[PDB]
């Protein structure tokens, strides 16, 4: 299973559906891959500094739920293949 | 209630108000004294009398080394340049990478006990420049007047074990240009003549993409030679000195240093970082500081880094137009973030813990 969230411009954490079209250059996103015990912190190319800073903080708090999962910050345009397969 | 931002460089102070687009006050980091009888003048007032005064730089290679004179610069910054009372304003200051812990404590002690600031914070210069570029991960080349650093930064925090320091920067380049100008018969020696050569350096120097070919074709080159008008109206002409001067950054042996060049220390810095973050560093090489202003430096860096990095590696050199002040602008951005207000060290907390608190909150 896999979940997906979004860090808003007003700091909230909101759930979103976790495939293909959710990617957009101005968002910072988090995807939890339970099979691989991995928390992906995805940043878009045009993500403003303060969502990136808070995306780091959101990933860390979600990681309190899964303290032995791997946290992997990734960036638009150079994501790992495992992440790409995860969504499409 | 407005925060102050002060970036104390070896050569220039950049100071202003958090939220301004750029530093309101840019002035030399000097204290001048008259020779006779063995008072003082600070900043612009020292240079306006550069003749009758002996100059001291309180910051050497980015490190504060003369604390009495540093106090004068801070007092000058607050009262004469910014025209504020420091006890009324939270104050963000900057420091060099690898600044010794005792220096950070002393800075804090002075801010709270001498200037009575209500709150303060000290940030690493290169980290601020990365933030100003919109990144929390990358490797910064920060080259100013007195020191050059390679600083890898991951998810908001510098990796000190991988930081490189190079005691080679703008002032050494000016001194070298003075030296090689003797080949055309030009003598620049005095403090004031050094300032002229600094201006020549800034207006006419550039980094060659292929230094060896630039030298070999310098003779046949029509457009290499440039003229420069001195204050007195006299004109000088220089040629391959234009690019031999900043070539020193890539070949420090030009001034008798056997340190590696900034391309190699960038590579060495990345190679001290974990394999899994090197790709993020290669793709986010951010340049900052006045000595990264030379035309051609980004393209030369791209070329050199590409030859050292893995063949498939994505390499990107970012040279923002504002990089002469990006450290300051980063501090303005940081000190204006609503989330940063918890990061201030308050006078209350200093009175409880003492200067040691700076290691915990900064
Ligand atoms: N256009 C330019 N071309 C080349 N060099 C420049 C240019 N503009 C400024 N410089 C050089 O940059 C230096 C000042 O830059 P900066 O203010 O970043 O240094 P600093 O922060 O005071 O020093 P440091 O960071 O090393 O303590 C001077 O040596 C100056 O000659
Ligand atoms: C316009 C300006 C540029 C600068 O970077 O100035 C700084 C600070 C300056 C202090 C002495 C000078 C007489 C006073 C003011 C010049 C400040 O020394 C420098 O010029 C030194 C000496 S030459 C050089 O390249 N760096 C750098
Ligand atoms: Mg500096």
Curated annotation (Swiss-Prot), chain B:
Taxonomic superkingdom: Eukaryota
InterPro entries per UniProt: Actin (IPR004000), Actin/actin-like_CS (IPR020902), Actin_CS (IPR004001), ATPase_NBD (IPR043129)
List of residues that carry N6-methyllysine: 72
Positions of modified residues (N6-malonyllysine): 49
Alphabetized UniProt keyword annotations: Acetylation, ADP-ribosylation, ATP-binding, Cytoplasm, Cytoskeleton, Hydrolase, Methylation, Muscle protein, Nucleotide-binding, Oxidation
Cited SUPFAM superfamilies: Actin-like ATPase domain
Record-annotated membrane-spanning stretches: none
ADP-ribosylarginine: residues carrying this PTM: 165
Gene3D superfamilies, per database record: 3.30.420.40, Actin, Chain A, domain 4 (3.90.640.10)
Modified sites of kind Tele-methylhistidine: 61
Pfam families per record: Actin
Compartments, as annotated in UniProt: Cytoplasm, Cytoskeleton
The UniProt record lists the keyword Cell membrane: no
Record EC number: 3.6.4.-
Primary subcellular site in the record, as a coarse category: cytoplasm
First-tier enzyme category under EC: hydrolase
GO CC, alphabetical: actin filament; actin filament bundle; cell body; cytoplasm; filamentous actin; filopodium; lamellipodium; skeletal muscle myofibril
The family this protein is said to belong to: Belongs to the actin family.
Subunit description: Polymerization of globular actin (G-actin) leads to a structural filament (F-actin) in the form of a two-stranded helix. Each actin can bind to 4 others. Interacts with alpha-actinin. Identified in a complex composed of ACTA1, COBL, GSN and TMSB4X. Interacts with TTID. Interacts (via its C-terminus) with USP25.
Annotated function: Actins are highly conserved proteins that are involved in various types of cell motility and are ubiquitously expressed in all eukaryotic cells.
Further information: In vertebrates 3 main groups of actin isoforms, alpha, beta and gamma have been identified. The alpha actins are found in muscle tissues and are a major constituent of the contractile apparatus. The beta and gamma actins coexist in most cell types as components of the cytoskeleton and as mediators of internal cell motility.
PANTHER family: ACTIN (PTHR11937)
Name of the featured protein: Actin, alpha skeletal muscle
Gene for this chain: ACTA1
């Amino acid at each position: 299973m896999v979940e997906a969230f979004e860090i808003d411009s007003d700091a909230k954490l909101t759930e979103t559906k976790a495939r293909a079209s959710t990617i957009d250059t101005e968002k910072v996103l988090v995807f939890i891959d339970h099979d691989e015990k991995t928390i992906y912190l995805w940043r878009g190319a045009k993500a403003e500094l303060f969502k990136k800073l808070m995306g780091t903080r959101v990933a860390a708090k979600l990681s309190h739920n899964y303290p032995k999962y791997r946290i992997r910050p990734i960036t638009e345009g150079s994501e790992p293949a495992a992440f790409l397969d995860l969504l499409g | 209630t407005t925060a102050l931002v002060c970036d104390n460089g070896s050569g220039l102070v950049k100071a202003g108000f958090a939220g301004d687009d750029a530093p309101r006050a840019v002035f030399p980091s000097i204290v001048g004294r008259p020779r006779h009888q063995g008072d003082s003048y600070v900043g612009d007032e020292a240079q306006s009398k550069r003749g009758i005064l002996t100059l001291k730089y309180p910051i050497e290679h980015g490190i504060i080394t003369n604390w009495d004179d540093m106090e004068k610069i801070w007092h000058h910054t607050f009262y004469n340049e910014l025209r504020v009372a420091p006890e009324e304003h939270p104050t963000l200051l900057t420091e060099a990478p690898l600044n010794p812990k005792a220096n950070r404590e002393k800075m804090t002690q002075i801010m709270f006990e001498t200037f009575n600031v209500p709150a303060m914070y000290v940030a690493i210069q290169a980290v601020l420049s990365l933030y100003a570029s919109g990144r929390t991960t990358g490797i910064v080349l920060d080259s100013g007047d007195g020191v050059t650093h390679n600083v890898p930064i991951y998810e908001g925090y510098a990796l000190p074990h991988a930081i490189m320091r190079l005691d080679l920067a703008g002032r050494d380049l000016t001194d070298y240009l003075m030296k090689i100008l003797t080949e055309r018969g030009y003598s620049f020696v005095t403090t004031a003549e050094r300032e002229i050569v600094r201006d020549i350096k800034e207006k006419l120097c550039y980094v060659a993409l292929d230094f060896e070919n630039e030298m070999a074709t310098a003779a046949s080159s029509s457009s290499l030679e440039k003229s420069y008008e001195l204050p007195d109206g006299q004109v000088i002409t220089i040629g391959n000195e234009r690019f031999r001067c900043p070539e020193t950054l890539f070949q420090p042996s030009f001034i008798g240093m056997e340190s590696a060049g900034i391309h190699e220390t960038t590579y060495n810095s990345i190679m001290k970082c974990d394999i899994d973050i090197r790709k993020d560093l290669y793709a986010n090489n951010v340049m900052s500081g006045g000595t990264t202003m030379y035309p051609g430096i980004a393209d030369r860096m791209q070329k050199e880094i590409t030859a050292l990095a893995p063949s498939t590696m994505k390499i990107k050199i970012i040279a923002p137009p504002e990089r002469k002040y990006s450290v300051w602008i980063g501090g303005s951005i940081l000190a204006s973030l609503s989330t940063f207000q918890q990061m201030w060290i308050t006078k209350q907390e200093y009175d409880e813990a003492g200067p040691s608190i700076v290691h915990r909150k900064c």
